[PDB]
Structure 1
Amino acid sequence: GLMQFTLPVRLCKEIELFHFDIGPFENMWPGIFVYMVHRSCGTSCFELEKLCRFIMSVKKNYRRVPYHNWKHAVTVAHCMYAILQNNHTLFTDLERKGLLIACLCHDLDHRGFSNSYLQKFDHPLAALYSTSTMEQHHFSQTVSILQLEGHNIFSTLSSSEYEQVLEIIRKAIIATDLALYFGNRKQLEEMYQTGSLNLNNQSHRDRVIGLMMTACDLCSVTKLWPVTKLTANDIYAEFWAEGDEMKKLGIQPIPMMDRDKKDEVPQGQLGFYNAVAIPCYTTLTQILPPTEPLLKACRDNLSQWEKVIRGEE
């Protein structure tokens, strides 16, 4: 009860900012996550013994892949923490509980390959789940870990609150399927413009929570340029490995995944910021004004990629 987590002074201050980097010390990441749960939700939301045992089980079930790893999980949870803390009153007690856990779990047991590669490989998960393949697997892995003896951090909820939180987590994890983001943001754009957007409408909250997940998932583009740039190396390290595997199946990969087309990466990043990142944080800032520092950090990083193209770096 009376046991808070405290961070060193630099982390204590910088963790509140959207652009915070969780640092290279793996052993501090669980404490960082616990700290965020305590300030975001309360010292009471979760039994510390159960929470700690859930975090270490989730960590264990992330693989040693260049990008879709335990550091990504905690990074994405931190961005969600920053959105929730800057939008205090807009979110229920349950949503704050569910969304930090959703973020921590959203890439559980990722192998470093896209849904496309699973399908073309004919991976068993592609038979079990025809769309949002990895994302249905991540939610499946989340429910499995929650059901390990001593791991049910939600045990103190009523049957109905329990079903509500697992439903928030499921929609939230599915929403991290980027193929669904485009349509989700279009509908949110229409609803905000025509003025029909209603945060009491559960189907409208769903869409908004979905956009928050896309925004947290893509948050490497909202960091200081050196974080953004070094994370991009890890992203391409997975992409190019998948391209290699595509070539093994006798399929020429898309240029994104062809290490032979490294040259075109800066232009590929412009497409990404314009097609995906900028629209995401724009609609998000329209709906949740205090998330504007994400849009501003994203535009700064678009500007940095433009400077790479122009040979200036």
Structure 2
Amino acid sequence: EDHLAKELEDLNKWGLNIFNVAGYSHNRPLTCIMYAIFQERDLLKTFRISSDTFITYMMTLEDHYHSDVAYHNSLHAADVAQSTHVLLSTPALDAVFTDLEILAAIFAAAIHDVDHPGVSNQFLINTNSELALMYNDESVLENHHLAVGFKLLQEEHCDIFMNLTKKQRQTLRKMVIDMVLATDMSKHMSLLADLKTMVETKKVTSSGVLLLDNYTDRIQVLRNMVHCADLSNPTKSLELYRQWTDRIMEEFFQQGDKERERGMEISPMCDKHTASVEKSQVGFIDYIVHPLWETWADLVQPDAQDILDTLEDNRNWYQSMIP
């Protein structure tokens, strides 16, 4: 209440503590943070979105994240949305995006993992799940998250984009699909290679603000921004990062337990009897998170240097915990 307002004073900051907001919002972190973000950016006024309609959609959307899944629940979506909200304000990106693009990125972050079952795409493919049969083994979960999020927009009492232009709805939909499909980790290397090429040919105004010519360049940055937000856990304070690590390992180890039950091959990092939690985060940082953030930093330099410093410190802490 008074605690919630205090925590929300850091809405525009990387140090915002989403666990605290969840505790003071009746376990509706996604709904609460999305509402705070939309008010801060005047998006309700700009896109003539009624508050009742927005809350109804957000609450329904939130209720579609599974509370018994350790990591991929509404708290993660709320964290990715808030992080995206901060990245969109990076000084190097000042005024580069339209209001419609800003709206799509945050919307995309909110819905990006909805109805996640707590098991990976590969698990769904190997167990011949209905989801994998439906989506022909390609970005199974991610096509699913999009389908649910857009499906929920179909009822009049939930259509937050009702007052957008027809062309605006088409553009937003195209951008949102692009962004969520880009959160599929199997596309990470490809996304990173393309980000490195954009850094290579980076152009700016005299005042250090990126110049993004066509829709193509703008959406490539937005895709990558949402992907960094999704892989932002190790760039946050150690206290936050460790809670995030505890949650993903609980989810991964539960997957391993389901694999063992069924006589399947146990995915190595999902095997509770052998996997080092500490070693695994070091590898995650060295081979995936750092290379991505190093490249993001280059694109928006020097705005992300503090994030990179925190990342290195967190990496060394996990390393120091390994005997």
Alignment partner, residue 184 of structure 1: 191
Alignment partner, residue 292 of structure 2: 280
Alignment partner, residue 57 of structure 1: 60
1:102 to 105, 108, 120: 108
Paired residue secondary structure (1:97): helix
Q: Does residue 1:10 correspond to 2:6, yes or no?
A: yes
How far has the Cα of 1:10 moved from its partner?
A: 3.0
Alignment partner, residue 283 of structure 2: 271
Name the amino acid aligned to 2:37. M
How far has the Cα of 1:214 moved from its partner?
A: 1.3
How far has the Cα of 1:163 moved from its partner?
A: 0.5
Q: Does residue 1:257 correspond to 2:265, yes or no?
A: no
Tell me which moved more, 249-258 or 178-187.
249-258
Q: Which runs of 5+ in 2 are unaligned?
A: 204-209
Consecutive aligned runs of 4 or more in structure 1 exceeding 6 Å deviation: none
When the two chains are superposed, the root-mean-square deviation of aligned CA atoms in Å is 2.0
| Deviations 1:72-96, CA, capped at 9 Å, x for gaps | 1111100001111234412111011
Name the amino acid aligned to 1:70. S
How far has the Cα of 1:192 moved from its partner?
A: 1.7
Q: Relative to structure 1, is the Cα distance of residues 293 and 54 closer, same or farther in structure 2, using a 3 angstrom cutoff?
A: farther
Q: Relative to structure 1, is the Cα distance of residues 181 and 198 closer, same or farther in structure 2, using a 3 angstrom cutoff?
A: farther
Q: Does residue 1:297 correspond to 2:297, yes or no?
A: no
Q: Which runs of 5+ in 1 are unaligned?
A: 1-5
Name the amino acid aligned to 1:21. N
CA contact (8 A) 1:40 1:84 kept: no
Paired residue secondary structure (1:153): coil
Aligned counterparts of 1:168 and 1:266: Cα–Cα separation in 2: 36
Aligned counterparts of 2:292 and 2:236: Cα–Cα separation in 1: 15
How far has the Cα of 1:9 moved from its partner?
A: 5.4
Aligned counterparts of 2:4 and 2:225: Cα–Cα separation in 1: 28
Alignment partner, residue 85 of structure 1: 89
| Deviations 1:91-132, CA, capped at 9 Å, x for gaps | 111011111111110001000010000000100111121211
Aligned counterparts of 1:16 and 1:119: Cα–Cα separation in 2: 39
Q: Does residue 1:38 correspond to 2:34, yes or no?
A: no
Alignment partner, residue 155 of structure 2: 148
Tell me which moved more, 229-238 or 6-15.
6-15
CA contact (8 A) 2:8 2:16 kept: no
CA contact (8 A) 1:40 1:81 kept: no
Aligned counterparts of 1:58 and 1:292: Cα–Cα separation in 2: 34
Pairs within 5 Å for 1:136-175: 136-175=143-182
How far has the Cα of 1:252 moved from its partner?
A: 2.4
| Deviations 1:179-218, CA, capped at 9 Å, x for gaps | 1121111121123225589622323222211211111112
Instruction: Report the count of equivalent residues.
Output: 304
Question: Percent of aligned positions with the same letter in both sequences?
Answer: 25
How far has the Cα of 1:167 moved from its partner?
A: 1.1
How far has the Cα of 1:8 moved from its partner?
A: 5.3
| Deviations 1:213-265, CA, capped at 9 Å, x for gaps | 11111222122112111211110111111111222332221220000114x22
